[PDB]
Design brief:
This is part of a larger assembly, with 4 copies of chain A. The first copy, chain A, is mainly β. Chain A has one domain. Chain A is built from 2 helices and 6 strands. Chain A is elongated, with a radius of gyration of 20 Å. Chains C and D meet through α1 and β1 of C and β2 of D. Chain A: It is found in: Virion. Chain A: Distal (knob) tail protein that plugs the end of the tube before DNA ejection and forms a channel perforating the host membrane during ejection. Chain A: This is Tail knob protein gp9.
């Protein structure tokens, strides 16, 4: 239920096109489809094992043995954990911090949507807006008349 | 054209709005606007309860008592079944 | 704009700031006399 | 994607007429046109190499070896970086602070 403090098979990725404002995300039909998509991203760096820092003051980061200039295109992180089996955890890269010439602090924020995508269960909820079926099979319009309040 | 006497015409809202409103009442009950003791456990599966300025007493420290009053003033669903969150049930009167 | 969609190979903090700028309204000047509203500003 | 912590070919400019309230800016048709516009601005100062400070607390600044009076007209900074190739980075000057 809780996100682990250490990771294995860690990968820092470039070119992940969504952010922690959570207005957009790539939705998947399975965790394997999810993995394949992320696996196709260019890897800026990998580590077989790492221990995370900063979880208490809620600004988690990982120590990366690279000069900061090798990480300018970092956008996302994924990792597994010894105690979570096959499960992948997903996180936005939010900041790069110079510690010394050969070591960089990479700050990240768990992507709660990607990380828990197949663990959530929606129950009946008040829907304000959604995309609905537009046409019946005979080609007639479905009946949607709720007042949009638009001119 | 056959028009004589009186006619009784019964009318009801469209299906689109019946679906909208019925689903809403199912989950959140009706507007009440009565000062009374709340319905806590009157339905089979769940009761929605929302008060304003509710009165709750007990042999309870006042900090926690104040917190409980806030919970009901903000609205809460009390589940009487283990299938928490399953709104598909009829939830008939107990 | 309102709720504008802007993408790019840009750190997400700056991208979010750019979206806020357009959601708040901005004037883009194509001439050096910035602020001179007396001009006709005809279609390009 | 991230702004670098060090700069090359640094220039502090005077007379750049827009601000960090972002209600106005000068729009360009190419990065070359943009560069030419900024390059034509009067330079208060130049440095071939510099390391930035304060990126940590989001209060970035640069140490400049000039008396503060020579910088009273400073309004803008542009710089390149070894790992970004030809790319120019642009910044508002927001404050002058006496060191010595």
């Amino acid at each position: 239920a809780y996100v682990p403090l250490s990771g294995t098979n860690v990968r820092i990725l470039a070119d992940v096109p969504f952010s922690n404002d959570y207005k957009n995300t790539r939705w998947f039909t399975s965790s394997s489809n999810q993995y394949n998509w992320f696996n196709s991203k260019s890897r800026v760096y990998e580590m077989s094992k790492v221990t995370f820092m900063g979880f208490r003051e809620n600004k988690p980061y990982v120590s990366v043995s690279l000069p900061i200039d090798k990480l300018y295109s970092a956008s996302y992180i994924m990792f597994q954990n010894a105690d979570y089996g096959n499960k992948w955890f997903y996180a936005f890269v939010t900041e790069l911090e110079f510690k010394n010439s050969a070591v960089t602090y990479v700050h990240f924020e768990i992507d709660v949507l990607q990380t828990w995508m197949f663990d959530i269960k929606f129950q009946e909820s008040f829907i304000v807006r959604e995309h609905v079926k537009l046409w019946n099979d005979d080609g007639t319009p479905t009946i949607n008349t709720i007042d949009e309040g638009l001119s | 054209n056959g028009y004589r006497g009186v006619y009784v015409i019964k009318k009801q809202l469209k299906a689109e709005y019946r679906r909208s409103l019925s689903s809403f009442f199912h989950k959140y009950g009706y507007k009440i606007n009565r000062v009374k003791k709340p319905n806590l456990r009157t339905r089979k599966a769940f009761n929605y309860v929302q008060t304003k300025d509710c009165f709750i007493s007990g042999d309870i420290n006042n900090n926690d008592l104040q917190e409980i009053r806030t919970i009901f003033d903000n609205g809460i669903t009390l589940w009487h079944t283990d299938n928490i969150g399953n709104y598909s049930v009829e939830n008939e009167l107990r």
